[PDB]
Tab-separated table of C-alpha atoms and ligand atoms in Angstrom:
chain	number	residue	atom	x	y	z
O	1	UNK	CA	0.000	0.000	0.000
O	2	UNK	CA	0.254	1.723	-2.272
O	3	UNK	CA	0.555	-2.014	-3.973
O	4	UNK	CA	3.368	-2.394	-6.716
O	5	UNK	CA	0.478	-3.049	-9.330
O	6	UNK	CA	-0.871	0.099	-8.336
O	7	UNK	CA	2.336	1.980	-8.635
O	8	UNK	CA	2.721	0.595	-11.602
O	9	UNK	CA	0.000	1.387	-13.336
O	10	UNK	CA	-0.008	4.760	-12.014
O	11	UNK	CA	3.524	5.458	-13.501
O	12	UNK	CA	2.473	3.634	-17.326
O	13	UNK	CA	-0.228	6.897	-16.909
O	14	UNK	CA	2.689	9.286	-16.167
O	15	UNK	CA	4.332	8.178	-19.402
O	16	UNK	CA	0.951	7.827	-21.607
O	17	UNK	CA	0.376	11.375	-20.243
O	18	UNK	CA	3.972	12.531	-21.108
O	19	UNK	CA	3.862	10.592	-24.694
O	20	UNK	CA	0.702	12.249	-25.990
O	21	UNK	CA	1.450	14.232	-29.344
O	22	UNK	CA	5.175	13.131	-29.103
O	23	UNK	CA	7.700	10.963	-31.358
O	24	UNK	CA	10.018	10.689	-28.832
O	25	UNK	CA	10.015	10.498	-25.288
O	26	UNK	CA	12.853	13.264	-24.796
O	27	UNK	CA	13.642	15.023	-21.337
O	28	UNK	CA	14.889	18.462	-21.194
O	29	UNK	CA	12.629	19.588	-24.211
O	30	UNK	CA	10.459	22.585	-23.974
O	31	UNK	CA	7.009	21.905	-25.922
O	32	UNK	CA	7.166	22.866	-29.644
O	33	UNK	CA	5.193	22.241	-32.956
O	34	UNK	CA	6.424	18.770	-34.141
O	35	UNK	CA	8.034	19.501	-37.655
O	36	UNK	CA	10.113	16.757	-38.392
O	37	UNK	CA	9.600	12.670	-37.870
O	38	UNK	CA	12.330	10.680	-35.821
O	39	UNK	CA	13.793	9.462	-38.771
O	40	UNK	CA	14.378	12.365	-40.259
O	41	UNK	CA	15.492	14.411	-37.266
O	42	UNK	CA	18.211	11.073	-36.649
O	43	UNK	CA	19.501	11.500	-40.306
O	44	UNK	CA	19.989	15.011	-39.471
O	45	UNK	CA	22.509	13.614	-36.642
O	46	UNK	CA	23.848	11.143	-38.668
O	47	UNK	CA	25.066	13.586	-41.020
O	48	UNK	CA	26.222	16.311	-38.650
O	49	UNK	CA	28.671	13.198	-37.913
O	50	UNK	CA	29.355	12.144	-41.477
O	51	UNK	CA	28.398	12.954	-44.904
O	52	UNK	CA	26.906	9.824	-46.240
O	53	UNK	CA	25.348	7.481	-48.284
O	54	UNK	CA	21.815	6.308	-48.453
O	55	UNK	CA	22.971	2.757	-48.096
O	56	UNK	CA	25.587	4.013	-45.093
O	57	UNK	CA	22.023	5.897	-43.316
O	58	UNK	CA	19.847	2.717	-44.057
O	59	UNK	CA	22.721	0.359	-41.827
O	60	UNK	CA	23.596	2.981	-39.054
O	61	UNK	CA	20.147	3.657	-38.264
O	62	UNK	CA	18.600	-0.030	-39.152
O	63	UNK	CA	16.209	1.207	-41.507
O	64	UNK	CA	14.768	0.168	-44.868
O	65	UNK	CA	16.116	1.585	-48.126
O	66	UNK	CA	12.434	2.608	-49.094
O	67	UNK	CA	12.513	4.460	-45.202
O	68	UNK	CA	15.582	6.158	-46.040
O	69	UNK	CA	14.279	7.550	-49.312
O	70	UNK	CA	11.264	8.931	-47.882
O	71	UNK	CA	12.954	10.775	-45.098
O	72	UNK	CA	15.486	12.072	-47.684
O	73	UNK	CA	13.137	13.116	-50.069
O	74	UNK	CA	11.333	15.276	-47.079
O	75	UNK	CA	14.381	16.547	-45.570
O	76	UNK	CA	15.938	17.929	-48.918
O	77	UNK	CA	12.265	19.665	-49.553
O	78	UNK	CA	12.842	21.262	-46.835
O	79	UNK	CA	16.280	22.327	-47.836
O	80	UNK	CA	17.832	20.952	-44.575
O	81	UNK	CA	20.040	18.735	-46.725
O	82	UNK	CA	22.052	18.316	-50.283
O	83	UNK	CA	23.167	15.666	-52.192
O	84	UNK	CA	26.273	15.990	-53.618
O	85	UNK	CA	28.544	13.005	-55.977
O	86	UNK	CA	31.295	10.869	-54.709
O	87	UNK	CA	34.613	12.156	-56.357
O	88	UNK	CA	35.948	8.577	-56.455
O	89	UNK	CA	32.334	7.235	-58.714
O	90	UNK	CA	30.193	9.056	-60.258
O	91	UNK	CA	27.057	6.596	-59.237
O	92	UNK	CA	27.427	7.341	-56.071
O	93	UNK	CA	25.333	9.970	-53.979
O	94	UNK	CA	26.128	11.453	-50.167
O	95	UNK	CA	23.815	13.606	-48.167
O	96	UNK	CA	25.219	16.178	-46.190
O	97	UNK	CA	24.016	18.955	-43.844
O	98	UNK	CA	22.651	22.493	-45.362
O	99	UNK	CA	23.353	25.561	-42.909
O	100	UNK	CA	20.262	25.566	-41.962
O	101	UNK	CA	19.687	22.084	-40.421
O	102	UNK	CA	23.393	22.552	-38.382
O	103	UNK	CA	21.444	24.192	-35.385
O	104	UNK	CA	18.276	21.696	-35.892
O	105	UNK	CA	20.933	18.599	-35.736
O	106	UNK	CA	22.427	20.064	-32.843
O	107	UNK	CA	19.670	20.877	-30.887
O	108	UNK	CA	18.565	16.974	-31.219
O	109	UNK	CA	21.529	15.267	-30.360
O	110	UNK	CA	21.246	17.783	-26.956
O	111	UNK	CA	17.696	16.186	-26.079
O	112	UNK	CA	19.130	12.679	-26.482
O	113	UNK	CA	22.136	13.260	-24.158
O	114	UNK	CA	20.209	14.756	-21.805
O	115	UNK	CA	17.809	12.138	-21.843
O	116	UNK	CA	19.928	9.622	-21.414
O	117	UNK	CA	22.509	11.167	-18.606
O	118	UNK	CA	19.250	11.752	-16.825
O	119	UNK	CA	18.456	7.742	-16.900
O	120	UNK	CA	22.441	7.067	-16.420
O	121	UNK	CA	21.906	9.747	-13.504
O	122	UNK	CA	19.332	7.493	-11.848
O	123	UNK	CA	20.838	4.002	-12.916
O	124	UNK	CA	23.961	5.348	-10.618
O	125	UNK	CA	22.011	5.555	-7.251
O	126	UNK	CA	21.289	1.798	-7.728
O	127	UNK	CA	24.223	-0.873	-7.354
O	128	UNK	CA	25.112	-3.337	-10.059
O	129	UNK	CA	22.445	-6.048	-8.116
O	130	UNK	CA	20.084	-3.553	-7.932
O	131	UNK	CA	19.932	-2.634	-11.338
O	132	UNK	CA	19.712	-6.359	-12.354
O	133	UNK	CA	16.660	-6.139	-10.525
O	134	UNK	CA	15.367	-3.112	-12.368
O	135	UNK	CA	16.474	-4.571	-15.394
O	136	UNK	CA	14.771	-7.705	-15.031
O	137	UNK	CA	11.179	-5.498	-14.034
O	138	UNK	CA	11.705	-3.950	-17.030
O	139	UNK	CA	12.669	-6.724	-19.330
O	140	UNK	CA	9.452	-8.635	-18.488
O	141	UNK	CA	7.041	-5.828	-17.755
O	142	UNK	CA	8.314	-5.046	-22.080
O	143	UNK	CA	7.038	-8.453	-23.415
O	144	UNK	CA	3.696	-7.300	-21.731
O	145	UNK	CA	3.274	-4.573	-24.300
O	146	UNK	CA	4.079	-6.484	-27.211
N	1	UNK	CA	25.799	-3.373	-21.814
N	2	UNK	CA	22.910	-3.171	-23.002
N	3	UNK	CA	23.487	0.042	-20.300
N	4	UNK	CA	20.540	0.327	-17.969
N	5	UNK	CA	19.879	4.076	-19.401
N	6	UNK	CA	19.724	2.473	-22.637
N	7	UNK	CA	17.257	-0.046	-21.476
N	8	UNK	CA	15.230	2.060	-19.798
N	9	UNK	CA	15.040	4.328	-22.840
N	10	UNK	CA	13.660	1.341	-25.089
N	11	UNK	CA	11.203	0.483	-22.210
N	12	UNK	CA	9.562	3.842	-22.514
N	13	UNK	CA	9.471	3.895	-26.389
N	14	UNK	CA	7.622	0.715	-26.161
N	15	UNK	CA	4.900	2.235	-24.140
N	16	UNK	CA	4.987	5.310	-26.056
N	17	UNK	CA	4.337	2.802	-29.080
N	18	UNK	CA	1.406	1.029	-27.217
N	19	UNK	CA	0.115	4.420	-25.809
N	20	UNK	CA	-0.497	5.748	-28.811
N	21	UNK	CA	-4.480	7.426	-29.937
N	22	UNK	CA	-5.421	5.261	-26.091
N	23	UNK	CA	-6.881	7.258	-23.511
N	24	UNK	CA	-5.687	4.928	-20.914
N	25	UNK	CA	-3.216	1.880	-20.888
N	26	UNK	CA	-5.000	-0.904	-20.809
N	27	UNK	CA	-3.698	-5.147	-21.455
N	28	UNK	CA	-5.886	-7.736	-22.677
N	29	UNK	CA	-7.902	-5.259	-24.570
N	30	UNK	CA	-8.269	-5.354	-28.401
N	31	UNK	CA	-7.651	-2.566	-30.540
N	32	UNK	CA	-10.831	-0.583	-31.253
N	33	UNK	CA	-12.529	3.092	-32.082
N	34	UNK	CA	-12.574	4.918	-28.778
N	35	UNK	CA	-16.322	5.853	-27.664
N	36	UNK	CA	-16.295	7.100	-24.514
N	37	UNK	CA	-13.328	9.271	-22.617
N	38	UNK	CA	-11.915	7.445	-19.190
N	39	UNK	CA	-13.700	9.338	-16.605
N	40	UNK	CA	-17.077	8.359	-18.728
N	41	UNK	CA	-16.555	4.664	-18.481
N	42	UNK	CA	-15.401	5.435	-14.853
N	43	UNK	CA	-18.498	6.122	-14.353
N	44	UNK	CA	-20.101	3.554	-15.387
N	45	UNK	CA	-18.210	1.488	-13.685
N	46	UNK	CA	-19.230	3.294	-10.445
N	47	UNK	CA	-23.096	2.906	-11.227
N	48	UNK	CA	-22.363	-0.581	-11.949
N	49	UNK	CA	-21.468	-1.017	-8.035
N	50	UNK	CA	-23.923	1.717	-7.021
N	51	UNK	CA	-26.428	4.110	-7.734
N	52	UNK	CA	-24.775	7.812	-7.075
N	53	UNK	CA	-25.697	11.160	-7.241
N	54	UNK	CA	-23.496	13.772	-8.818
N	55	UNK	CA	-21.835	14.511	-5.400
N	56	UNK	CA	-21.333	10.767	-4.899
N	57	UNK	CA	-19.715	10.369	-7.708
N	58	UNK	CA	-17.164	13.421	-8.080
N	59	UNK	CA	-16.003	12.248	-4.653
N	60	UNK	CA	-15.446	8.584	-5.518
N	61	UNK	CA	-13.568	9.255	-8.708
N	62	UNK	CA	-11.939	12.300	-6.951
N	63	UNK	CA	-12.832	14.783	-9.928
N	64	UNK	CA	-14.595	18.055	-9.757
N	65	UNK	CA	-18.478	18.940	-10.434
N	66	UNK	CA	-18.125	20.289	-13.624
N	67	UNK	CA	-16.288	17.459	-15.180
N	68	UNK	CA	-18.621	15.188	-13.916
N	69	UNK	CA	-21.500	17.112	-15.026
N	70	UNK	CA	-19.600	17.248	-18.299
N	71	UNK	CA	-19.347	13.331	-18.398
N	72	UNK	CA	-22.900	12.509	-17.244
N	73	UNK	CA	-24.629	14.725	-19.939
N	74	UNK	CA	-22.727	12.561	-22.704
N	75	UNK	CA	-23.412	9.205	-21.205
N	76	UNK	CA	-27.001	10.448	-20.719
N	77	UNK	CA	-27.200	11.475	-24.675
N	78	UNK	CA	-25.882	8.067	-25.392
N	79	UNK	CA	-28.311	6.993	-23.168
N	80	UNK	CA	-26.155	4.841	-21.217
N	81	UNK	CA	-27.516	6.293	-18.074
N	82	UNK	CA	-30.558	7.402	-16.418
N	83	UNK	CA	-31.818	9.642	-13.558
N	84	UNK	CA	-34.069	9.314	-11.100
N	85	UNK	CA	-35.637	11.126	-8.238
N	86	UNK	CA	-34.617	10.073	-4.394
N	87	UNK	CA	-37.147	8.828	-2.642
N	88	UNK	CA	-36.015	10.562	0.514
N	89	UNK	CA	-35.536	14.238	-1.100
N	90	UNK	CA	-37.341	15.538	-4.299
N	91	UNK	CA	-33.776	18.039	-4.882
N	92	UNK	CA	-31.736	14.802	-5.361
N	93	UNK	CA	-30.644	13.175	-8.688
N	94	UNK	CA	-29.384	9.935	-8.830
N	95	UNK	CA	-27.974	8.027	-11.771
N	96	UNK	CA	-28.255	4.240	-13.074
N	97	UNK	CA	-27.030	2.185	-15.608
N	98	UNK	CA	-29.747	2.187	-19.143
N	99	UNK	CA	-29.244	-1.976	-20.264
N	100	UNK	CA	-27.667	-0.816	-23.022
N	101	UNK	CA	-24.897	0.224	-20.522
N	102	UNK	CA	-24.186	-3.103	-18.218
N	103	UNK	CA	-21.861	-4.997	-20.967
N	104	UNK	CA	-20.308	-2.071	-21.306
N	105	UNK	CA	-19.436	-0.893	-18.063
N	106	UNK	CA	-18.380	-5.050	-17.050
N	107	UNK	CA	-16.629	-4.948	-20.201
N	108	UNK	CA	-14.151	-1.652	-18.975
N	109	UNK	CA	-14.084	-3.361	-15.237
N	110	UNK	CA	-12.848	-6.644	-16.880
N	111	UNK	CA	-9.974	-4.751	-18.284
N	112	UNK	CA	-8.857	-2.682	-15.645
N	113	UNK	CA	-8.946	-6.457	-14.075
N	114	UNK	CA	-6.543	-7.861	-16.058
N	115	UNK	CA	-4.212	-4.960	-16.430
N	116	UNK	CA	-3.786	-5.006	-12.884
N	117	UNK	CA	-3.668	-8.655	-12.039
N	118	UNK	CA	-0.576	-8.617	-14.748
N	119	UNK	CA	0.962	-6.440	-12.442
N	120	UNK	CA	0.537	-7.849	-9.587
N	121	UNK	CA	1.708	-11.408	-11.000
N	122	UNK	CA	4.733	-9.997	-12.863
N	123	UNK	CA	5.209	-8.433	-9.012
N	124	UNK	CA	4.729	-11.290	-7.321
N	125	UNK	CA	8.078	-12.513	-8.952
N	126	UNK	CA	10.119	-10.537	-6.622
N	127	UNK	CA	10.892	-10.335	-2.822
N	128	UNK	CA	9.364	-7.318	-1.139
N	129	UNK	CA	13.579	-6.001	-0.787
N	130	UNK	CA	13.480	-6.426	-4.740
N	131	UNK	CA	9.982	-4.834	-4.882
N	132	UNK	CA	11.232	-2.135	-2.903
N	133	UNK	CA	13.972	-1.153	-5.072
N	134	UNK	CA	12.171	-1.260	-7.920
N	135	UNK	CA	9.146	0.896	-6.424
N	136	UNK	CA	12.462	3.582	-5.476
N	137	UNK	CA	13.332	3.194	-8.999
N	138	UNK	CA	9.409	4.270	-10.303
N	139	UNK	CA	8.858	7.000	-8.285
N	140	UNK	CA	12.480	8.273	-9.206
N	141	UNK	CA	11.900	7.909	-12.897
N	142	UNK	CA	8.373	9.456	-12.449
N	143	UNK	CA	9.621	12.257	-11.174
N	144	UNK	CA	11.381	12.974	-14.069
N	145	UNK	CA	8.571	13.094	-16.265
N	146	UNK	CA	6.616	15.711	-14.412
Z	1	ZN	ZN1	15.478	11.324	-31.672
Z	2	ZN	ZN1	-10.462	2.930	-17.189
């Protein structure tokens, strides 16, 4: 009392509650109009890293080549970024970053650290046989929600 | 490795995932259009057990008058509920299920049911010291998400 079911279920309605409208559940993030998908805004990263392929976004980000080429084709409408051709073959395309999406990019990786350092954050209170615990919760309560 | 930040990051994009156009998160439940809001089928739920008069009612589900006056005149239009006069005091209103109303109301019970008797069997798994830590663990994490 309160019961573990109940606290539970009470916290799945924090997140629902937190989720609604969202992509992403991101920490640190003041409300805004959602203008890009997650895909999109995580090819934005990929590229502030690396100019690249469509084939080299489809394997770091475990997507579909027909998932890549909708994102791209969105993202370079938006002029966020340009293709350009591979000096060493003329086949192949890259994608890099446009001026415009360098702040965009940069403001997304910064709500993904800061989400995660805020888990790793709490993770740290708990000792290695406490986390297994956690860890096992959370592995199990998962296959619930498949 | 998989980190526990990581982990706990996937956990919450599967709920996002499952959260998603729900008004309340619900297992054993099939996917279908959503009718009525929560605190309508709450109330139903509550007639189910008891007839209840407005005052009865914003107590028991802890809400204010005018959102249960705002609930009761849709479940009324649907005419999934009824009033009636108390026999004791002409002034007082109280509400019952229509027939049309019963499956439904046992139907939303049922679920709540099962959503919470996962939770308490996936609970009953641990010791109350491993409960413990992971209730620490929830109410940390919840806090973050306020
Ligand atoms: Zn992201
Ligand atoms: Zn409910």
């Amino acid at each position: 009392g309160m019961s573990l079911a109940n606290q539970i279920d009470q916290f799945l309605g924090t997140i629902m509650q937190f989720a609604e409208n969202k992509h992403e559940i991101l920490l640190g993030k003041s409300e805004s109009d959602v203008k890009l998908t997650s895909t999109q805004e995580h090819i934005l990263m990929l590229l502030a890293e690396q100019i690249s392929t469509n084939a080299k976004i489809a394997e770091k980000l475990k997507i579909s080549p027909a998932a890549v080429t909708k994102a791209l084709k969105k993202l370079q409408e938006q002029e966020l970024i340009k293709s350009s051709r591979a000096t060493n073959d003329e086949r192949v395309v890259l994608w890099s970053l446009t001026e415009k999406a360098v702040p965009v990019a940069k403001e997304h990786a910064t709500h993904h650290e800061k989400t995660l350092s805020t888990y790793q954050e709490l993770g740290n209170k708990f000792t290695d046989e406490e986390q297994e615990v956690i860890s096992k919760f959370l592995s199990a309560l998962t296959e619930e929600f498949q």
